[PDB]
């Protein structure tokens, strides 16, 4: 399909957590989503919230519609569970690497299914609970998913980082390394 | 592998030359079975799993009239409304050249995504040995690209990385 | 300001 700009509503409901998401992307960039727990509309950039507005019930009700379609398609398909697709992990910084300059490390998990992940940041082989931030489970054209994980870090000399990814398609957690 | 099943759907608006095309997909576990296309006009089955669902939807004629009005009621509405902050959003890129024998021109923090990154050696554009990466999405409405250039370094040579972008009045250049 | 969305149909 030929297009100059693509605006897509994406939503999914599953058995495990997260049991549901409702987002809207503009040119493959998540603009906003509906927090199914707080029942509010969360905008990506604050610029959008000042110029737009979305009814949170439009996402809440559509999630309920997909929940019915989930139970219906579970019976019609005779409880067929899809195969676990292996994720692809690549780590890269947001800005040019520089000592003392607070940068942001990006871990891009891609081409996986189902949307169930346990992603965690590791610095020098130790956990990093500070400066962690993640995106939603973003959709793809082949109906698989991709996700972003961020870590605000200050580059030092001998510091190396890792992106530990746990998925049902991996027999052991995957460690994607980055040092330069 | 614990027990888990998934249902998902899409509502896609394709804008091009003042036209709006709407597609509504119904997917079960990465398998699209039902689909509405505004160019088609009615619901269609993509798999045998979605044939009973498509026939029931083509019977409710008011819903077929609703889905046919989507390209004008939803796609054209959201397109003309979000114009300022999405259709015309500009973030100027930042260029950086590091030796890393390679030479990496790391362009960062540009949103429109369409960008040209050329190499120059003493004012002459170099093409051989240029290895550019794909458009990298940061996920924060900013893009990123890395164009590595291998070189035969000779003292006195000046390598310049030229970057042209829609958000820039004149091309930005950084030299090494 | 108000954006538009669409209702997914019930499969049955």
């Amino acid at each position, epitope marked *: 399909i030929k297009a100059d700009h693509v605006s897509t509503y994406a939503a999914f409901v599953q058995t495990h957590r997260p049991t549901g998401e409702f987002m809207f992307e503009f040119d493959e960039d998540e603009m906003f989503y509906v927090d199914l727990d707080k029942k509010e509309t969360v905008w990506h950039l604050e610029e959008f919230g000042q110029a737009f507005s979305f009814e949170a019930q439009g996402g809440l009700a559509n999630i309920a519609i997909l929940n019915n379609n989930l139970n219906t398609l579970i019976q019609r398909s005779n409880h067929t569970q899809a195969t676990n697709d292996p994720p692809e992990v690549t780590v890269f910084p947001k800005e040019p690497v520089e000592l003392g300059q607070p940068n942001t490390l990006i871990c891009h998990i891609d081409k996986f299914f189902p949307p169930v992940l346990n992603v965690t940041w590791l610095c020098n082989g130790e956990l990093v609970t500070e400066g962690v931030a993640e995106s939603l489970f973003l959709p793809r054209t082949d109906y698989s998913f991709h996700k972003f994980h961020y870590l605000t870090f200050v580059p030092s000399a001998e510091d190396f980082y890792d992106c530990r990814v746990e998925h049902w398609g991996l027999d052991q957690p995957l460690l994607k390394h980055w040092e330069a | 592998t614990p027990e888990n099943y998934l249902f998902q759907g899409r509502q896609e608006c394709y804008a091009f030359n003042g036209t709006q095309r709407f597609l509504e997909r119904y997917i079960y576990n990465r398998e699209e079975f039902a689909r509405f296309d505004s160019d088609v006009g009615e619901f269609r089955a993509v798999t045998e799993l979605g044939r009973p669902a498509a026939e029931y939807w083509n019977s409710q004629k008011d819903i077929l009239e609703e889905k046919r009005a989507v390209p004008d009621r939803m796609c054209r*509405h959201n397109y003309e409304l979000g114009g300022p902050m999405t259709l015309q959003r500009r973030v100027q890129p930042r260029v950086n050249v590091s030796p890393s024998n390679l030479l990496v021109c790391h362009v960062t923090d540009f949103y429109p995504g369409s960008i040209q990154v050329r190499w120059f050696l003493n004012g002459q554009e170099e093409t051989a040995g240029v290895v550019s990466t794909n458009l990298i999405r940061n996920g924060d409405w900013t893009f990123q690209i890395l164009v590595m250039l291998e070189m035969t370094p000779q003292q006195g040579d000046v390598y310049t990385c030229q970057v042209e972008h829609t958000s820039l009045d004149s091309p930005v250049t950084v030299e090494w | 300001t108000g954006l538009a*969305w669409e209702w997914w149909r019930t499969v049955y």
Partner: T-cell receptor, first 109, second 119 residues
Framework: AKTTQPISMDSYEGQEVNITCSHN???????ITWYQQFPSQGPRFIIQ???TKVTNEVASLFIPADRKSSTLSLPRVSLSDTAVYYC???????????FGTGTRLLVSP | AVVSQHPSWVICKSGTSVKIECRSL??????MFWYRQFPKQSLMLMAT?????????EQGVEKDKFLINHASLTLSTLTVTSAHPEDSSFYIC???????????????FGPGTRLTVTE
């Protein structure tokens, strides 16, 4: 949005009745839906439309190009059609599709 | 899509609590509206209940006077806490079925509730 309708209408049996609804400040986002409420019961949906003209068993809906108004054309009216007819405009949400003072159509024999 | 509303007739003394059940028999709804019509006047939307959330009360009603509970996707109940002769009206409820039914906007009203409070 808030609509404006005639408070009541008079007619004779067998006459085509046209109820014009004025909704000037309509949007690309809104839809036109009509209801019918008989005495001692609640309203009931009868017809809807966006742009194009719609015709069903109960009535027809005429929508001009500007979409600032809509006419409900009930066919050959019978005394069983003496009811209140509501005109509602709004989007797919649930945000106050107010039921204004409908058109109390009276079909006198 | 059928909506049931019980009870259909209710008579009670002032101060009595009156619970009205508005059920969606063949569909599950996240929002179910509550209306009220007077013997000679027109319809008036009282409040809009949401599943697991707060009810969007319209202007004129008191949440401490009409307690509303959206217990399930099928059930939504309205409770007249303190009975008063002024509360005597015709209470109707509606519910939208965006996924099923001929229309996404069609509000399916219930049979109605005739209420009369006496001293």
């Amino acid at each position: 949005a808030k609509t404006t309708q005639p408070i009541s209408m008079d007619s004779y049996e067998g006459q085509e009745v046209n109820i014009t609804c004025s909704h000037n400040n309509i949007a690309t986002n809104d839809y036109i839906t009509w209801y019918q409420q008989f005495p001692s019961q609640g309203p009931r949906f009868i017809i809807q439309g966006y742009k194009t003209k719609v015709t069903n068993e109960v009535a027809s809906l005429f929508i001009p190009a500007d979409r600032k108004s809509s006419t409900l054309s009930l066919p050959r009216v019978s005394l069983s059609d003496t009811a209140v007819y509501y005109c509602l405009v709004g989007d797919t949400g649930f945000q106050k599709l107010v039921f204004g003072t409908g058109t109390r159509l009276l079909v006198s024999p | 899509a059928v909506v049931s509303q019980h009870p259909s007739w209710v008579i009670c003394k002032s101060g009595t609590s009156v619970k009205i059940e508005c059920r969606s028999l063949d569909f599950q709804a996240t929002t179910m509206f509550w209306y009220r019509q007077f013997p000679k006047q027109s319809l008036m939307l009282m409040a809009t209940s949401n599943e697991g959330s707060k009810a969007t009360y319209e202007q004129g009603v008191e949440k401490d006077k009409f307690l509303i509970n959206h217990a399930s996707l099928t059930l939504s109940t309205l409770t007249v806490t303190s009975a008063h002769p002024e509360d005597s009206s015709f209470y109707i409820c509606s519910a939208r079925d965006p996924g099923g039914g001929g229309s996404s906007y069609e509000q399916y009203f219930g049979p109605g509730t005739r209420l009369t409070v006496t001293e």
